[PDB]
Structure 1
């Protein structure tokens, strides 16, 4: 679900950042690990902010919606970390939003790939599952990525742990593909990010 908006691509892949106070050294290490992970697989770079108008601010706040997707023009944007959403994989995901990705399951073509089980969604949270409008996403010729760091789990925003809100429609290597990994950038995330930022081969 890569943004179609050219203004939302960070020029030259350069993303200035500020780490807010109140973070422990341990937490700051995770932020650096997450940023270096992006840097090591793509041409995106993170720079300590000096006088740039647009930059990201690691902010210590309760977990939940919402992040700005891509570069916000004319002011900073928060990347929010809380007690229960501070691990490497979650920060990598949030940096996915920063660079310009919406949630994978909201791709305009997602109905070919997953079913949404509406009756299992937490009332009021259905907006989490609405497709991006077709003009808001340019997938850059890349197929739907079940392994994406940006993909929800099977039971995200569900009425219960054992009730699925998202069910892949078909088998890959004999089984329905697992979704919602928060280990690392997928092969798909990297290929697509490289296209989005026009990274040198």
Structure 2
């Protein structure tokens, strides 16, 4: 679910950043690890912010919907890191939003690949499952990626332990594809980010 908006692509892949106060060193290390993970696999780079108008701020506060997708023009955009959303996988996901990805399960073609069970979503979190209108996404020829760090698990924001919010429609290698199990960028994430940022080979 790569943004179709050219103005939301960080120019030259440069993403200036500030880390707010109140984080432990341990938490700051996670941010660096997640940023490095993106840097190592794509041409995106994270720079300590000096005087740039647009930049990201890792902000110590309760977890909550909803993060800005891509570069917000003209002022900073906060990433909410709280006690329950400060692990590597979640930060890598949130940085995916920053670089310009919506959730994979909200791709315009998503009903070909999964079913959303809206009844099972926690009230106030349905924003995270709402299908993107087709003009808002340009997938760059890449197919629906069940392995994406931007794809939720079967029960992400579910109302109960044994209830699914997302159910894949079909089998891949004999089973329904595992979703939302990985905590690292997928092959598909990397390929697509490389096209989005026009990275050299």
**Cα distance, 1:120 vs. partner?**
2.0
Conserved? CA contact 1:155–1:166, under 8 Å: yes
Post-superposition CA distance 1:76-104 (Å, at most 9, x none): 00011100100111110000000000011
Over 3 Å counting, the alpha-carbon distance change for 1:124 and 1:95 in structure 2 is: closer
For residues 55 and 182 of structure 2, the distance between their equivalents in structure 1, rounded to whole angstroms, comes to 24
Conserved? CA contact 1:90–1:182, under 8 Å: no
Post-superposition CA distance 1:120-152 (Å, at most 9, x none): 223443333221010000000000011100011
For residues 119 and 77 of structure 2, the distance between their equivalents in structure 1, rounded to whole angstroms, comes to 34
For residues 115 and 80 of structure 1, the distance between their equivalents in structure 2, rounded to whole angstroms, comes to 28
Post-superposition CA distance 1:132-191 (Å, at most 9, x none): 010000000000011100011101222211011110001111100011124200000000
For residues 130 and 20 of structure 2, the distance between their equivalents in structure 1, rounded to whole angstroms, comes to 32
Gaps of 5+ in 2: none
- Size of the alignment, in residue pairs? 201
Conserved? CA contact 1:93–1:182, under 8 Å: no
**Cα distance, 1:20 vs. partner?**
0.7
Match of 2:192, SS state, is helix
Conserved? CA contact 2:9–2:70, under 8 Å: yes
Gaps of 5+ in 1: none
RMSD (CA atoms): 1.0
For residues 34 and 197 of structure 1, the distance between their equivalents in structure 2, rounded to whole angstroms, comes to 18
- Normalising by structure 2, report the TM-score: 0.97
For residues 81 and 35 of structure 1, the distance between their equivalents in structure 2, rounded to whole angstroms, comes to 14
Aligned to 2:197: 197
